[PDB]
Design a protein around this ligand. Structure first.
Ligand code: CL
Length: 216
């Protein structure tokens, strides 16, 4: 007896770590699913994932490592990078710590170097390649938060997943804020207070939910 294929799922509020058969180390963020084989095929090292993970890929220049998501294939020979691709999110991002990374989509193929990032907007189809501190992007590894012109909906999803908390918007209020912020491991209430400071977004408890709102 022996398993050939495994699926690891991460709940909201938690983290998981996996060493793959090739020696690649994966850090899986809250709400992530990853399918991987107990032995890789001879031609590539393929994994399937939905959510967010940080990969530390074992260099093998004759056997590419592929992170397959619904929207893209992230291919390396070696390196370390973050893939953020939650099904519920409007954005997708691939950020490189070390190594060279190819992000392959039907409409674009881009090769990224350390501290380069690709942001794909699943709504309007806009793609952006820019420079970004990969250490800040991977702040979730140490339970931190990093927002750089991040839409409020992505901020809410990040908070819901990190703290395993339902966060709901007040239907009377308009929310189209872009958040800027950097938080060390803090409580949800400390982060919501920091967001209140820079946006005026207030929060209230309604049973098991947190309701966000604004007022004049
Ligand atoms: Cl490397």
């Amino acid at each position: 007896s022996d398993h050939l294929l495994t699926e690891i799922s991460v709940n909201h509020g938690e983290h998981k770590q996996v060493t793959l058969p090739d020696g690649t180390v994966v850090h899986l963020n809250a709400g992530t699913v990853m399918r991987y084989p107990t032995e890789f095929t001879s031609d590539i090292r393929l994994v399937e994932m939905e959510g967010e993970a940080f990969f530390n890929v074992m260099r093998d220049e004759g056997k590419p490592f592929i992170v397959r998501t619904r929207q893209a294939d992230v291919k390396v020979l070696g390196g370390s990078f973050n893939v953020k691709a939650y099904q519920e999110d409007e954005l997708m991002a691939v950020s490189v710590r070390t190594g060279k990374v190819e992000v392959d989509m039907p409409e674009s193929v881009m090769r990224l170097l350390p501290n380069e990032q690709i942001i794909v907007n699943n709504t309007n189809g806009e793609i952006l390649k820019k420079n970004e501190d990969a250490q800040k992007v991977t702040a979730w590894l140490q339970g931190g938060l990093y927002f750089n012109r991040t839409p409020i909906s992505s901020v809410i999803h990040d908070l819901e997943r990190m703290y395993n908390q339902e966060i709901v918007l007040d239907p009377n209020v308009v929310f189209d804020d872009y958040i800027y912020g950097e938080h060390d491991n803090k409580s949800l209430e400390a982060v919501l207070n920091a967001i209140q400071y820079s946006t005026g977004i207030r929060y209230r408890k309604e049973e098991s939910r947190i309701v966000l709102y604004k007022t004049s």
